[PDB]
Design a protein around this nucleic acid. Structure first.
Lengths: 158, 118, 50, 122, 203, 86
RNA sequence: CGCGACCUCAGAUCAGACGUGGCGACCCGCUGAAUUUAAGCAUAUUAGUCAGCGGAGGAAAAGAAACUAACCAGGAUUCCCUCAGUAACGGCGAGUGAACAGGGAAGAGCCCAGCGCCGAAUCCCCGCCCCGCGGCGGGGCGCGGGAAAUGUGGCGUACGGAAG
């Protein structure tokens, strides 16, 4: 019953809610669980970027957010084609692809072309056999300065 | 071939026998109810020593899964004797008792001494 | 009754051999806590099931 | 007589069975000695004979199955006793071979597009 | 190829050609038992699509399902509740009769694993469905790496859990605005998140 | 005469010892166990009796096979190998 | 009349495998109440909840758009924060009640049928030799058998593909 000037408030506790209470004593153990896995993965993907493959410059949809820029799902097939990267070879050298992404602008297209141009120059490519540097590889003195990129690779700034 | 019967009946089709590539179990499970495990022990009871010295029998405790045939061929092989008949009851205790009436060409008291009861 | 089955007579045979007191050398043990046999089953008082 | 398992495994098929049918006779004399009332010196021995029956029958049953899974070793169909018991689900798994079968289309993707060891600069 | 000609002929079910075959076979299917093995696919064409490669270990059972909805099993039509739950006659079962077919083929053939199924006839009283069954233990399937997904213990009784293509359509899943109530795993998984207090440690 | 006298006529049993679950709940006329349902392939258990489940589940008996599966798991279900001798 | 093919349904203690039952916290598929709330009560609410039934797994289900959107556009699924007690539902009463965008955890993609091309180029199984494995696999060697043109295998799948 209402006493005086109160707020006409409606709690959602008319169901058997006590059975389905999700407690967060997992949280500090979970943050260690995720962190131990993140370290063990980073040491596995041994000289590669820790955060994973490069994500493209992507505008946020809806009029609220289109003043901002994100990391996308992966690079469009015409962003790779104008850059001159094969969509099956892109994934192997650490480039995110999604075939779903159209390109409506030349601005976002040529920005993500110039993104892949900056990436491939930054890229250090090991031979598939150590005792056989093949034609599409890098030099020994440029292979010894290879360190895991802590943080997201080429961080996308607004 | 002419249809005498207005019934159709399934014809006697050929069936072959089990010609298996391997025996299911590797070896036969040995007879764990031996001649030894089928006779547990004799009764040295006053009632049973009467039965030995009066009726010319031996009173044994037998494994509950033994026939009167299985006892006779056990007592014949364990004690170098022969049995006239066997009479079996299962006790209130749950164990089986065998009143092993010997053939009268053997003194049960002289073979009760042989098995080693006094 | 007099007319029994081998399964029932086996059931009764077990419940006889469980219905005996403790051995008096069991209470002289180290980690001994047993005074008497608590599961002793008299035939007037408790009627064994069935 | 102290009977070990070391000194039985070198002995013969016909040798062990007679030693078993000697212990069975020795135990047949001790079971009587419990009922005829006396000899605590004998009553404590009946365990020593019971366990030495278990020693000889083990050495009998071990050399049975050593010979059987030696006999069926190279054979493709062997008895269900000799086949490897793990968990039931672990027998129902794919083979060491069948898990390692790639399709021709998948072998091509491994071949033409192999996963590169790469590193990027800051 | 012939399959495209059989495909588009099977879309002309109102034609004199197919109305003869869908009727004369539907007669033949009534005279057979409610669940029996078909020696082949009735439709070689449709079975190609749903994954039937004609090699050893692939099985096709022609099972019939008694046609109509579902009347509530209550004694003498008396549900002893509130006037909402008084309904019995005009009620409908949540899963399709094609899914009811697959889960009798799969229940009967517990050793096998149900791939898919396709319609082959309907009467006043029955529908008829060929159900594609696979052997997870025949070495033709157990060695083929693109069909050894059924051979793993995760795909035991797909038909019973609504993993078969016919079974999935009763759940209400898919992407977008129409399939919000099964976002997450299923209708059951959606319900849980929405009715769980995330009582954080700090809050 | 519905009480003390009517008790006297009780001399013919409905239930006997069931041969799956051992309980004295095997009805003789219906020929079905009121505890486990013996002629039924499946064990009779109901979720409305949490107490009746914990009486008769995997914690009750020996687990004479399932105790060694727990012992044989924690080395990886190894077979055929014996340790190095003396 | 007989004989050989095929099709179709049969029988076998036929050769070899496979399913059943249990556990059931979590997961999937169904089925599914009434207490209660509305100060009565019937729609609603309780609640797609308990009970019932089936099927699993170490996780399950979901999953690479017949999507969101209406932007300068995003790009599988799952989970967390927020959106939001909001849009909406409701004897518009009691109550019920998402989604997208955004910030993160994680991040991975793929295969067929069809259409077509190559002499079925494909597969299972039995005999012997030979390595060899307590996940029964490897190499031979057989006018040895079978499946399969009512379609196996390779290329190839909407991101296009193939041939020259």
């Amino acid at each position: 019953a209402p006493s005086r000037n109160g707020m006409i408030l409606k709690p959602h506790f008319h169901k058997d809610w006590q059975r389905r209470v999700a407690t967060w004593f997992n949280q500090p153990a979970r943050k260690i669980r995720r962190r131990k896995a993140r370290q063990a993965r980073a040491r596995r993907i041994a000289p590669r970027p820790a955060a994973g493959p490069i994500r493209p410059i992507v505008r946020c949809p809806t009029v609220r957010y289109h003043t901002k820029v994100r990391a996308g799902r992966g690079f469009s097939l015409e962003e790779l084609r104008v850059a001159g990267i094969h969509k099956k070879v892109a994934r192997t050298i650490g480039i995110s692809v999604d075939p779903r992404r159209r390109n409506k602008s030349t601005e976002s297209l040529q920005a993500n072309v110039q993104r892949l141009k900056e990436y491939r120059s930054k890229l250090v490519l090991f031979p598939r056999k150590p005792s056989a540097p093949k034609k599409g590889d890098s030099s020994a003195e440029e292979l010894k300065l290879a360190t895991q990129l802590t943080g997201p690779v080429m961080p996308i700034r607004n | 071939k002419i249809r005498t019967s207005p019934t159709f009946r399934r014809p006697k089709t050929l069936r072959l026998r089990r010609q298996p590539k391997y025996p299911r179990k590797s070896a036969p499970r040995r007879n764990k109810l031996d001649h030894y495990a089928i006779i547990k022990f004799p009764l040295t009871t006053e009632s049973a020593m009467k039965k030995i010295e009066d009726n010319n029998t031996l009173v044994f405790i037998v494994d509950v899964k033994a026939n009167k045939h299985q006892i006779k061929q056990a007592v014949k092989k364990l004690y170098d004797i022969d049995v006239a008949k066997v009479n079996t009851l299962i006790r209130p205790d749950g164990e089986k008792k065998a009143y092993v009436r010997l053939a009268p060409d053997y003194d049960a008291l002289d073979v009760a001494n042989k098995i080693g009861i006094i | 009754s007099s007319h029994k089955t081998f399964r029932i007579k086996r059931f009764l045979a077990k419940k006889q051999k469980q219905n005996r007191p403790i051995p008096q050398w069991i209470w002289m043990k180290t980690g001994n806590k047993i005074r008497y046999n608590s599961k002793r089953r008299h035939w007037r008082r408790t009627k064994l099931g069935l | 007589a102290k009977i070990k398992a070391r000194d039985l495994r070198g002995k013969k098929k016909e040798e062990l069975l007679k030693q078993l049918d000697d212990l069975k006779v020795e135990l047949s004399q001790l079971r009587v000695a419990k009922v005829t009332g006396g000899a605590a010196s004998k009553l404590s021995k009946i365990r020593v004979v019971r366990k030495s029956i278990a020693r000889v029958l083990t050495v009998i049953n071990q050399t049975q199955k050593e010979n059987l899974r030696k006999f069926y070793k190279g054979k493709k169909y062997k008895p269900l006793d000799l086949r490897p018991k793990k968990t039931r689900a672990m027998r129902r798994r794919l083979n060491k071979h069948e898990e390692s079968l790639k399709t021709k289309k998948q072998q091509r993707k491994e071949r033409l597009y192999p996963l590169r060891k790469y590193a990027v600069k800051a | 190829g012939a399959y495209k000609y059989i495909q588009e002929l099977w879309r002309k079910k109102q034609s004199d050609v197919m109305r003869f075959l869908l009727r004369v076979r539907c007669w033949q299917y009534r005279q057979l038992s409610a669940l029996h093995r078909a020696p082949r696919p009735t439709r070689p064409d449709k079975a190609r699509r749903l994954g039937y490669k004609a090699k050893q270990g692939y099985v096709i059972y022609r099972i019939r399902v008694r046609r109509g909805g579902r009347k509530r099993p209550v004694p003498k039509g008396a549900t002893y509740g509130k006037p909402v739950h008084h309904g019995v006659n005009q009620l409908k079962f949540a899963r399709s009769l094609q899914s009811v077919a697959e889960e009798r083929a799969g229940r009967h053939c517990g050793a096998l694993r149900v791939l898919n199924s396709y319609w082959v006839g309907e009467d006043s009283t029955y529908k008829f469905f060929e159900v594609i069954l696979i052997d997870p233990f025949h070495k033709a399937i157990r060695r083929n790496p693109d069909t050894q997904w059924i051979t793993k213990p995760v795909h035991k009784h797909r038909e019973m859990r609504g993993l078969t293509s016919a079974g999935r359509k009763s759940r209400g899943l898919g992407k977008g605005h129409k399939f919000h109530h099964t976002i997450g795993g299923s209708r059951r998984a959606a319900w849980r998140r929405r009715n769980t207090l995330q009582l954080h440690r700090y809050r | 005469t519905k009480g003390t006298s009517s008790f006297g006529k009780r001399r013919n049993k409905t239930h006997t010892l069931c041969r799956r679950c051992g309980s004295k709940a095997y009805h003789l006329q219906k020929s079905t166990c009121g505890k486990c349902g013996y002629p039924a392939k499946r064990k009779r258990k109901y979720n409305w009796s949490a107490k009746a489940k914990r009486r008769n589940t995997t914690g009750t008996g020996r687990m004479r096979h399932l105790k060694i599966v727990y012992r044989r798991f924690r080395h990886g279900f190894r077979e055929g190998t014996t340790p190095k001798p003396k």
